[PDB]
């Protein structure tokens, strides 16, 4: 899931919804899970390390 | 309280990716390291502005590189430091009335006169410092 | 900021005498050590209230026993620690209006609710802490 | 020398220090020309030399 | 780790009595505070010399007044600080052979020359510092 | 009529033995209980606070 | 005393380049960041070994990222931390005789037994710690 | 001056002499200026920032 688009899709299928955008930063909220999750969207591959951190924030 | 370590990851075919461990959920990226650092500050500002607008809690710690560097999730990462005053990110702050002892107020007023600060800005920053010390 | 080392002297035919090195000019006494400690707190409160009433500057440092213990004026003294909140000593505090970010204000209100403090008390204490950090 | 609290207060008064407030046994003194507020314990007994010297120093004596 | 806080108790009809909380079991006394401080250093030296002579473990912490002052067993006590180098108290030390890198040895020799210390004294003190840091 | 005397007696009856003396300092060892216990002597009353500390060190 | 911040620079058409500000003169490189960190440790070891061999003074500070990060010569750099025990780098150490109190020696021996260190290694490390403390405190 | 070869040459023309090599690390000493200068030799372009640091250490 290193592609930013595939990653955003995985978050969305988990119920995370886009609420705000700041340049390339995409801010996501969930109706049941806690926290705001910011995902960078370059439409390119992100490093595995930053991907894992995003998954952890999203409760995945 | 205003300086945040950022963890920079980079794979063979990837861009530079950034984590801000002290503000949970903040992530960023860049084609270059200079871009990644610049983007990360904008992502912090945007993330916290979003929280403020939604009336969500803004929770954040203040760590040094040293206390973060050995955590397994940051293995192989490189570090930088981003300066953001989170207390200036509310566009609709609340106006309130408070009783401040005269001697305290005189010290505040004398301190902010020489600097590029206001009473309100000084107090908000000082309040966050004190709340971080109450958490430590 | 609220804890002051006190230096206790005692001669053969004297009472216990007390110096508070961090608040210049403060001295006290006691027939016993327990009396001397109790009197010293009252002498601090009274001294600072007098300063406030006269509109004098209230200047004070925050030292540890260790940094004071070796000074020649305290040779042979014994030490204790007195807790006084100097920010509560103004009977005519000034009412001011300040803009506090909503997220900061929510954290303040939550913190003071459990401790039965007020916003004003919290902010005055926090202001003094921050000014001491700006000095040291 | 000036270890009796009464003699000490007298010496301060003759130097121009004026009693402005009293808090129990604590006697708070102000001077028209010399700086600071000087708090002197008044048990009407001998104070230790060490606390006496500190009081003298605060009073510019 | 050569400076030990001492807790001084005093009752209406008693002498001054002293506890050294960092060296377990050490106690002393004095008719006056100056006597009590002088006696306490002698009691430390004697206590540790006794341990050494019996080949018992010499265990000791290094505390500040501040971290001890609030403990219930020291309620109402007053504090002083006694300086004793415990590493100089063995009259039969053991002679050993060790390999020290030349650059380290040159720094040791230069450091002790100005301070009128010996290599052995420096190393014993440094060893105790490092073991205290290992116990954190 | 000094508490230091009563305290030393109580230690001795508990099995604590005097092993060295350094001026007024009396150093006690026990065959089963751990630690060396130093008791200040010159026969006078010690404060309750220092007495309790001595009792604690002696396992009393 | 054993952990050194390294400053990593990178230009558009360059390799990653490394500076070790605490050990003056040490520099390194890598094709990747992981290579640069690996190379930097080898460069430190080699540099200090060379100093020792030439009988030069081995002078080094111990800094945190924070105190270095704002210096103009490191602007735009990223940081990592390299662990090197400089006290193990002398192949010809000097044998000396010292008097150690028995209680101190028992504590040393107990401490190094679990960590598989030697008395000499322990003492050299402890000596460097104490000299670094003697420079500020 | 960012090529490691050109940089080493510049050091050598300033009187710096290679005394030891550790893999790609080239250790240089000067007969009339103090200190040891370690120069990486990948035979590629080094970043300007690490180049300037090397120049400063070498008094170039």
PDB file of N, CA and C in Angstrom, chain G residues 21 56 67 102 104 107:
ATOM      1  N   UNK G  21      29.979  16.803  13.454  1.00  0.00           N
ATOM      2  CA  UNK G  21      30.512  18.049  14.001  1.00  0.00           C
ATOM      3  C   UNK G  21      31.324  17.891  15.307  1.00  0.00           C
ATOM      4  N   UNK G  56      48.335  11.911  18.024  1.00  0.00           N
ATOM      5  CA  UNK G  56      47.686  13.228  18.068  1.00  0.00           C
ATOM      6  C   UNK G  56      46.684  13.237  19.278  1.00  0.00           C
ATOM      7  N   UNK G  67      21.213  21.277  19.810  1.00  0.00           N
ATOM      8  CA  UNK G  67      22.200  22.361  19.886  1.00  0.00           C
ATOM      9  C   UNK G  67      22.958  22.599  18.592  1.00  0.00           C
ATOM     10  N   UNK G 102      38.774  -1.860  47.783  1.00  0.00           N
ATOM     11  CA  UNK G 102      38.172  -3.193  47.630  1.00  0.00           C
ATOM     12  C   UNK G 102      36.658  -3.134  47.329  1.00  0.00           C
ATOM     13  N   UNK G 104      35.030  -0.717  45.876  1.00  0.00           N
ATOM     14  CA  UNK G 104      34.877  -0.171  44.516  1.00  0.00           C
ATOM     15  C   UNK G 104      35.136  -1.290  43.512  1.00  0.00           C
ATOM     16  N   UNK G 107      32.317  -3.721  43.154  1.00  0.00           N
ATOM     17  CA  UNK G 107      31.204  -3.163  42.394  1.00  0.00           C
ATOM     18  C   UNK G 107      31.488  -3.192  40.921  1.00  0.00           C
TER      19      UNK G 107
END
